[PDB]
Design a protein around this ligand. Sequence first.
Ligand SMILES: [Cl-]
Ligand SMILES: [Cl-]
Ligand SMILES: [Cl-]
Ligand SMILES: [Cl-]
Ligand SMILES: [Cl-]
Ligand SMILES: [Cl-]
Ligand SMILES: [Cl-]
Ligand SMILES: [Cl-]
Ligand SMILES: [Cl-]
Ligand SMILES: [Cl-]
Ligand SMILES: [Cl-]
Ligand SMILES: [Cl-]
Ligand code: NI
Lengths: 122, 121, 119
Amino acid sequence: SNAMIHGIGVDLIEIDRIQALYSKQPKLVERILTKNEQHKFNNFTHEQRKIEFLAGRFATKEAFSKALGTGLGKHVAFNDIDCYNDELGKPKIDYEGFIVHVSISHTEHYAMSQVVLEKSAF
Amino acid sequence: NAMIHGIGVDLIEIDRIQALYSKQPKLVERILTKNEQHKFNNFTHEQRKIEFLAGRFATKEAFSKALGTGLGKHVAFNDIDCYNDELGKPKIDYEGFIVHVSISHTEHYAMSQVVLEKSAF
Amino acid sequence: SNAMIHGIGVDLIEIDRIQALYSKQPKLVERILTKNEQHKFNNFTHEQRKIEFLAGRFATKEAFSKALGTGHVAFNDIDCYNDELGKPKIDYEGFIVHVSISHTEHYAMSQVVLEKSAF
Ligand SMILES: [Cl-]
Ligand SMILES: [Cl-]
Ligand SMILES: [Cl-]
Ligand SMILES: [Cl-]
Ligand SMILES: [Cl-]
Ligand SMILES: [Cl-]
Ligand SMILES: [Cl-]
Ligand SMILES: [Cl-]
Ligand SMILES: [Cl-]
Ligand SMILES: [Cl-]
Ligand SMILES: [Cl-]
Ligand SMILES: [Cl-]
Ligand code: NI
């Protein structure tokens, strides 16, 4: 085999900023979500969970876009990046041609995500 | 044919660890291996103690996430021995893999990242 | 055979500390930023952007240094530049360097992964 790292991305998001944005323009904020992510979001009852979810998605989607690079990836629509967790709780994103590695974390005030994209060299 | 087995990241609020340690010091110290406990027991400043604990929480959590095993295999925090190379670069050994670790902290936050790489052999 | 990871590094910086650095000791900037980075820093007209830039670069150099390990590089010899899409980049003989930077109002962070060169 001939694996190689294509690119990496990291993003840190201040949860309070996302709280403010969501209170002001909830529908505009929700446009970053895919249909699957929207379905999940619509089942939440509590605002704290809603904001954590959104903040985490902002962070992951940005980290992924940065890792991909290319004009194509820099300009990927956030609502076309479907983030999910596997049956073991590992965050994932499917993207043809790459093995996408993701990791997430959050605290009360911050959400952070990192992405590493690997590729076969040929 | 991946070269990377998994990655993990964790961010920890130091103040939360301060609170936890003040309330349940013994429970908190149980996250440490015997080797880590030996290091901890030599510290004389509280600030260093809390930073050490916060950094270990972050690193152990990042490592756990990089494993990608969910609730499928039980790994105790006191079975993840974070140590230093002779210059202080953080390390963790995990048979079958090459483990890469990096740690950073500020006054209020500790973070850690772990990458588990596939071994050639 | 697969490429190999030489090392990884991460760094988190509180922007207020960097604000204090610049205000109290602007000439320290010369020991941190490369000539190319200094050219960019000197052209900012908005102080908030200027401090964010410096914080991000400081974080990047610390992350790079951690990734390289010591088995030695001056901060003002580690040039992080950006490509035509904005992506931060560092060129360093013997390695493929991967870099990512992120900022919030109060924090800057950077991560670096050094991969071993072959082809
Ligand atoms: Cl933010
Ligand atoms: Cl709206
Ligand atoms: Cl909920
Ligand atoms: Cl979720
Ligand atoms: Cl926390
Ligand atoms: Cl106790
Ligand atoms: Cl001490
Ligand atoms: Cl800091
Ligand atoms: Cl400006
Ligand atoms: Cl340039
Ligand atoms: Cl970036
Ligand atoms: Cl950013
Ligand atoms: Ni594996």
